[PDB]
Design a protein around this ligand. Structure first.
Ligand code: A1IBW
Ligand code: CL
Ligand code: ZN
Length: 288
């Protein structure tokens, strides 16, 4: 009856290599970047400016009035290196094998782009640090990450070279809307998906979580995550891994890198993935 012959990683791999599985959507969160040294900051467990309410450091109005706290925090939090993980390059391999329909990401850390996913491949649901824009509606001059980095480390508040307005990283602040691309792509992609690969997200933040209920009822959904997630909340189309009615949802519990390695091994891609990661990491390590 069901597309998966068994509710295991092996069943998912067999399905992926069957002619039935042509279009994969990845939904990813902070768990795919922790092994790169990027901490999960939506986690309250990780991490003077006289804010009227602390969220003002991420609220667009306060930023526009008092941007210095945000850029001081950005200097403190700036990564020492931008090296994507095995998981990121697994998605690049999906792209190379012609299986990747779209990667929806909650992360702003740019590692999807560094790993070789193109803008067309990506829905950065919470924005990105990869580009920044002048905040003046009549200008909107775009600046790359290197320019913003120089400004941040020199502790100069970044101003537009054309109009001297503030320049803001393209992350979604409080009081801003989610990008229209998120809804536009969701409405089209989920008519087309054969497999949902959910990696490194607890599916707790909305509307990003509700994406899993946009899949067709037959579409298998594989969670690769440290903890099970996405099931219906006993208090309030959720994941069903374990009931007798379960038919399409699979949980692989562990680090995202190790799960992607296990899946690649099942697919016969482990050598390809190892070679890609080793060469890309070497290229990043060698940046002079
Ligand atoms: C520099 N910065 N600043 C912030 C903020 F201020 F918004 F919190 C976030 C980041 C950032 C940028 C790229 C990759 C990873 C991170 C965070 O680990
Ligand atoms: Cl989450
Ligand atoms: Zn400008």
């Amino acid at each position: 009856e069901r597309l998966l012959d068994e509710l295991t990683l092996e069943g998912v791999a067999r399905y992926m290599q069957s002619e039935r599985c042509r279009r994969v959507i990845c939904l990813v969160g902070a768990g795919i970047s922790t092994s790169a040294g990027i901490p999960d900051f939506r986690s309250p467990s990780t991490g003077k400016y006289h804010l009227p309410y602390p969220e003002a450091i991420f609220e667009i109005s306060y930023f526009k009035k008092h941007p210095e706290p945000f850029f001081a925090l950005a200097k403190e939090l700036y990564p020492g290196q931008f090296k994507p993980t095995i998981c990121h390059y697994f998605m690049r391999l999906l792209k190379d094998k012609g299986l990747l329909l779209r990667c929806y990401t909650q992360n702003i850390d740019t590692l999807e782009r560094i790993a070789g996913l193109e803008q067309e491949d990506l829905v950065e649901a919470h924005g990105t640090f990869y580009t920044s824009h002048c905040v003046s509606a009549s200008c909107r001059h775009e600046y790359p990450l290197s320019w913003m980095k120089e400004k941040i480390f020199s502790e100069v508040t970044p101003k537009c070279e054309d109009c001297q307005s503030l320049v803001k990283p393209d992350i979604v602040f409080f009081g801003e809307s989610l990008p229209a691309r998120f809804f536009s792509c969701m409405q089209s992609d989920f008519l087309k998906v054969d497999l949902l690969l959910v990696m490194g997200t607890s599916l707790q933040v909305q509307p990003f979580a509700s994406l899993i209920s946009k899949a067709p009822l037959s579409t298998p959904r594989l969670l690769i995550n440290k903890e099970k997630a996405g099931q219906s909340d006993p208090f309030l189309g959720g994941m069903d891994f374990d009931s007798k009615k379960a038919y399409r949802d699979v949980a692989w519990l562990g680090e995202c890198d190790q799960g992607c390695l296990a899946l690649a091994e099942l697919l016969g891609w482990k050598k390809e993935l190892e070679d890609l990661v080793r060469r890309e990491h070497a290229s990043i390590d060698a940046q002079s």
